Amino acid sequence: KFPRVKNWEVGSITYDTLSAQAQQDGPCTPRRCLGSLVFPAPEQLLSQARDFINQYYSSIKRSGSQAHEQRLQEVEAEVAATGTYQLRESELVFGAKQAWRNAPRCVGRIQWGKLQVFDARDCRSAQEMFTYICNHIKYATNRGNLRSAITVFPQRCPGRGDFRIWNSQLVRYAGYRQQDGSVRGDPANVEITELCIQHGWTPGNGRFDVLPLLLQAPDEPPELFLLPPELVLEVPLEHPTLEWFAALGLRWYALPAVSNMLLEIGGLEFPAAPFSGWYMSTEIGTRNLCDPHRYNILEDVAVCMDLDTRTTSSLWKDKAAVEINVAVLHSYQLAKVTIVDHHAATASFMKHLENEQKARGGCPADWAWIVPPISGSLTPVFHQEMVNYFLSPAFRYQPDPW
Amino acid sequence: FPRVKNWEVGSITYDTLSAQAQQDGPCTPRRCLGSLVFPRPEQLLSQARDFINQYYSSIKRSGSQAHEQRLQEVEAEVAATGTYQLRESELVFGAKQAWRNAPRCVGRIQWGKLQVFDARDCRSAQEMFTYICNHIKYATNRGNLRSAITVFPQRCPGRGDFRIWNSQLVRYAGYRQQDGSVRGDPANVEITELCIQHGWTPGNGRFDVLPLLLQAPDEPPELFLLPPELVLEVPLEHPTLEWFAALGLRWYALPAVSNMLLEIGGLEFPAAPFSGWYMSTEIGTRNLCDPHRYNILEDVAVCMDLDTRTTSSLWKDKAAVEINVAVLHSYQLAKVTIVDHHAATASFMKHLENEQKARGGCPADWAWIVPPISGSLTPVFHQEMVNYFLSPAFRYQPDPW
Ligand code: HEM
Ligand code: HEM
Ligand SMILES: Cc1cc(N)nc(CCc2cc(CC[C@H]3CCN3C)cc(F)c2F)c1
Numbered sequence: 102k103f104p105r106v107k108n109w110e111v112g113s114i115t116y117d118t119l120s121a122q123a124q125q126d127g128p129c130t131p132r133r134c135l136g137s138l139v140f141p142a143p144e145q146l147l148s149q150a151r152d153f154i155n156q157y158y159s160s161i162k163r164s165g166s167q168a169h170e171q172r173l174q175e176v177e178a179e180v181a182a183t184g185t186y187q188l189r190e191s192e193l194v195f196g197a198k199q200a201w202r203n204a205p206r207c208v209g210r211i212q213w214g215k216l217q218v219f220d221a222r223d224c225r226s227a228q229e230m231f232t233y234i235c236n237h238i239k240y241a242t243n244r245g246n247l248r249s250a251i252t253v254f255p256q257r258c259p260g261r262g263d264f265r266i267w268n269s270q271l272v273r274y275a276g277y278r279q280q281d282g283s284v285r286g287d288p289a290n291v292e293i294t295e296l297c298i299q300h301g302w303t304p305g306n307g308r309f310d311v312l313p314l315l316l317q318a319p320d321e322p323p324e325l326f327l328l329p330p331e332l333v334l335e336v337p338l339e340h341p342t343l344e345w346f347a348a349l350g351l352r353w354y355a356l357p358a359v360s361n362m363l364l365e366i367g368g369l370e371f372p373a374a375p376f377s378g379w380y381m382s383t384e385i386g387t388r389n390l391c392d393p394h395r396y397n398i399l400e401d402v403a404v405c406m407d408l409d410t411r412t413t414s415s416l417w418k419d420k421a422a423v424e425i426n427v428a429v430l431h432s433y434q435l436a437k438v439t440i441v442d443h444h445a446a447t448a449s450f451m452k453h454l455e456n457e458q459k460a461r462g463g464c465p466a467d468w469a470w471i472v473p474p475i476s477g478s479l480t481p482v483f484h485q486e487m488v489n490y491f492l493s494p495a496f497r498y499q500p501d502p503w
Numbered sequence: 504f505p506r507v508k509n510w511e512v513g514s515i516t517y518d519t520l521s522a523q524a525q526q527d528g529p530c531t532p533r534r535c536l537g538s539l540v541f542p543r544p545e546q547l548l549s550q551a552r553d554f555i556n557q558y559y560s561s562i563k564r565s566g567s568q569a570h571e572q573r574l575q576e577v578e579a580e581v582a583a584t585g586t587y588q589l590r591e592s593e594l595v596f597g598a599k600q601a602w603r604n605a606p607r608c609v610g611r612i613q614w615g616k617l618q619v620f621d622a623r624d625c626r627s628a629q630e631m632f633t634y635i636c637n638h639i640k641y642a643t644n645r646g647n648l649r650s651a652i653t654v655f656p657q658r659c660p661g662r663g664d665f666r667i668w669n670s671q672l673v674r675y676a677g678y679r680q681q682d683g684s685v686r687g688d689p690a691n692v693e694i695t696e697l698c699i700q701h702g703w704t705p706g707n708g709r710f711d712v713l714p715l716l717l718q719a720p721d722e723p724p725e726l727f728l729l730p731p732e733l734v735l736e737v738p739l740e741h742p743t744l745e746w747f748a749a750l751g752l753r754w755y756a757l758p759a760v761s762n763m764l765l766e767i768g769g770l771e772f773p774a775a776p777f778s779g780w781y782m783s784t785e786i787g788t789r790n791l792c793d794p795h796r797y798n799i800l801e802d803v804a805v806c807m808d809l810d811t812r813t814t815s816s817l818w819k820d821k822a823a824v825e826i827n828v829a830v831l832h833s834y835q836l837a838k839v840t841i842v843d844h845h846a847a848t849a850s851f852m853k854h855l856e857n858e859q860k861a862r863g864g865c866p867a868d869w870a871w872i873v874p875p876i877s878g879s880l881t882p883v884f885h886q887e888m889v890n891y892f893l894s895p896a897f898r899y900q901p902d903p904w
């Protein structure tokens with residue numbers, strides 16, 4: 102009645118008992134599995150809040166204490182008087198860490214307890230929101246010694262619109278639809294680029310132009326804010342032994358900072374709560390640079406390497422991709438900017454799974470996102486069966502505000 | 504009807520074929536178990552009725568005289584005897600369908616070209632061995648490999664089953680040690696000790712071809728030495744790394760799966776070995792580089808003078824690409840059919856487009872379709888897939904012992 106899970110490299114078997122507590126429902130049925138798809142009232146607020154309060158008082162060894170029951174009654178009474186409730190500062194910190202811990206697609210969760218939580222729930226305007234965001238970027242970047250962080254802006258509440266960051270990440274390169282239909286820059290960012298221009302941004306014409314932030318205060322149009330260039334640390338890409346690689350003029354930014362996800366804690370929703378960590382090298386080298394629908398550099402690099410691109414069996418794509426990933430790792434290490442390779446990251450994720458089996462009886466994990474996009478079966482997570490399910494607190498997708 | 508998106512091109516399709524999914528799978532709204540290798544009497548007539556309907560739809564003759572006639576016959580056969588017999592053409596159709604329905608098979612663009620050997624009159628283990636031998640010779644074909652399946656007698660109540668105890672027709676010995684380790688293939692330590700147990704004189708090499716354990720109903724298995732010239736093997740060499748040949752690596756030509764159960768129209772065939780040709784990553788990445796298999800990756804990296812002291816040199820990735828190159832070069836030089844993972848996945852994308860217009864979708868298991876190296880460099884990575892069970896099917900079954 103609890104899923105049995107095998108690791109095929111060692112022979113291990115565990116049972117994921119935590120999955121039986123899964124609090125919301127996913128896309129799969131006994132009919133059909135949809136695991137590979139990218140996108141899968143006071144009483145119900147109270148029951149969500151009650152579960153989270155139970156989690157919080159369990160974590161501090163105060164389950165069933167005087168303070169525990171008091172907090173339950175306080176929330177009950179605030180939901181009856183106001184239709185909502187406010188988290189205490191310690192509850193917010195706990196909830197943000199649990200949301201990361203619970204994120205099935207994150208291979209970086211060995212780190213979940215080391216998260217700096219900035220409380221911006223008093224934020225008042227898009228201009229104050231910008232200042233909070235700049236300081237998050239400065240703290241998290243830390244001159245290349247990256248530190249995980251999240252900034253939480255005010256929750257959704259009755260009577261008011263949302264705070265929203267329109268950008269999908271705090272640092273993103275412009276994607277300029279050009280008139281053939283090609284894109285100069287990042288094709289993933291064509292939409293937000295057009296929105297920025299529409300709100301008064303004077304565009305560039307380079308491949309690596311950092312976009313401005315579009316920031317929305319409750320019941321206000323979004324407002325455009327240019328990031329100070331010295332806050333955006335970037336890494337020019339070179340290769341340790343292919344000297345022509347630097348002449349590609351490729352770059353990437355230090356800080357991966359997701360800004361468009363919804364943070365849900367105890368039934369409360371925080372539509373603006375950007376979080377950042379540090380990159381895994383395959384995110385940059387394999388996906389961002391080599392996806393055919395992104396920068397798509399693979400064939401240019403292969404031609405430069407003198408590989409035989411006329412036949413698939415020469416494995417020219419694999420050879421070129423390896424050297425691009427080498428170039429990313431080398432360049433970030435040379436620049437003294439935190440980066441993790443996919444072998445170290447998946448090894449640390451295996452330790453996380455062992456930690457979590459002891460702590461909670463399992464760990465929600467999405468195999469297709471945990472296994473790296475190159476060298477899959479060379480990493481230990483390939484051979485680990487995984488159980489995917491939804492726990493709260495959680496980071497959730499939400500529709501684009503436009 | 505699940506909506507399914509390809510993220511490289513941005514196109515959308517709907518898998519309407521999923522709505523007819525039969526034997527339910529392991530996932531629930533509460534938890535997805537898509538990554539698990541093994542998913543967690545008048546009913547015979549329902550499965551035969553549906554399969555006969557499948558048959559006459561495919562030949563554009565549903566609701567015609569031969570269709571109604573065949574419906575009554577299976578009814579009368581089951582009423583009289585409790586089971587029924589497939590016509591030769593239906594057995595051919597069902598074998599091709601079970602391959603077409605195999606969600607984990609990336610090679611399904613070939614599903615229309617399958618040679619079916621009808622062995623339902625087999626009656627002894629010596630008979631099996633001659634059948635298996637005929638299959639291997641036909642399928643190998645001096646290196647110009649041809650997909651094939653041999654269908655041994657169906658399961659029936661009261662009697663025992665035909666079983667092949669080997670997981671494949673060609674396997675290498677796995678010899679345990681004075682200290683746990685293994686000379687040879689660790690995937691086959693269990694069946695190596697069974698062959699030795701039934702009288703097989705073991706060897707001392709890393710690539711000794713195991714004998715066959717063939718089991719006629721209610722008889723203990725019997726060893727059969729495979730004729731050495733029937734087992735086509737490929738010594739592994741690298742096109743430029745001259746020392747690679749000195750590693751003494753070899754693999755065999757024919758991937759022939761001999762432990763799966765073939766289910767057609769409610770009938771069960773526990774002995775129905777099928778074969779095709781290898782995708783290069785199966786040999787170079789999984790069989791040779793998996794930690795619990797031959798685990799050669801670090802030895803190749805030492806010969807390449809790579810820095811094995813830091814994971815961020817990507818020495819594993821570099822060594823693995825060169826192993827896969829050596830596999831492709833060696834099989835092409837030996838004139839033995841093989842397909843690289845780029846070609847195979849591009850053909851699978853074509854297969855998805857064909858199946859979209861033919862049947863309204865295609866059951867596909869993303870984790871098994873995406874190759875074990877260079878995943879996001881292939882188009883299947885960016886293709887959302889829906890996994891579900893149709894019949895006819897190849898199913899897993901308990902090991903016979
Ligand atoms: C500290 C280093 C971190 C590493 C190395 C890391 C690694 C990754 C990777 C490789 C992905 C896959 C995303 C993709 O392929 O586009 C991912 C997803 C994710 N990460 Fe982490 N991450 C880190 C920190 C964090 C932090 C600090 C948070 C939140 C506090 C977080 C939350 C998430 C979430 C919610 C996802 C899901 C993204 C989605 O569903 O699209 N991660 N992570
Ligand atoms: C002709 C070329 C073929 C290619 C290139 C090919 C390729 C593959 C690959 C790479 C797998 C992954 C399984 C694993 O790695 O464990 C697979 C699975 C499978 N193949 Fe094919 N195959 C071919 C022919 C066939 C034929 C002729 C049949 C049956 C008539 C077949 C039936 C299956 C089945 C049932 C599986 C599922 C394996 C499992 O779930 O363990 N294949 N195939
Ligand atoms: C904090 C952090 C550190 C590291 N290393 N990587 C990441 C992943 C980047 C990341 C990327 C995406 C894009 C996914 C699909 C869904 C919408 N988009 C088209 C969606 C995320 F939610 C996310 F988080 C985050």
Ligand SMILES: Cc1cc(N)nc(CCc2cc(CC[C@H]3CCN3C)cc(F)c2F)c1
Nearest residue numbers: 540758759760763777778779780781782785
């Ligand atoms: C005909 C054909 C051609 C090619 N190229 N590849 C194959 C796949 C080989 C193949 C391999 C396995 C091992 C999988 C795990 C599950 C049990 N075992 C430990 C299980 C199969 F069922 C199978 F078929 C077949």
Ligand SMILES: C[C@H](O)[C@H](O)[C@H]1CNc2nc(N)[nH]c(=O)c2N1
Nearest residue numbers: 137138139469470884885886887
């Ligand atoms: C269609 C498929 O689900 C999609 O490409 C997924 C697969 N696995 C992934 N894994 C990670 N880490 N990131 C991704 O964007 C994706 N994309």
Ligand SMILES: C[C@H](O)[C@H](O)[C@H]1CNc2nc(N)[nH]c(=O)c2N1
Nearest residue numbers: 483484485486538539540870871
């Ligand atoms: C744990 C995981 O599901 C398991 O290792 C699967 C993953 N995908 C696979 N894909 C193929 N083609 N063959 C395999 O054996 C596996 N193994």
Ligand SMILES: [Cl-]
Nearest residue numbers: 357384385389
């Ligand atoms: Cl990114």
Ligand SMILES: [Cl-]
Nearest residue numbers: 758785786790
């Ligand atoms: Cl194999």
Ligand SMILES: [Gd]
Nearest residue numbers: 341342343344
């Ligand atoms: Gd050089």
Ligand SMILES: [Gd]
Nearest residue numbers: 805806807808
């Ligand atoms: Gd040397």
Ligand SMILES: [Zn+2]
Nearest residue numbers: 129134530535
């Ligand atoms: Zn599922």
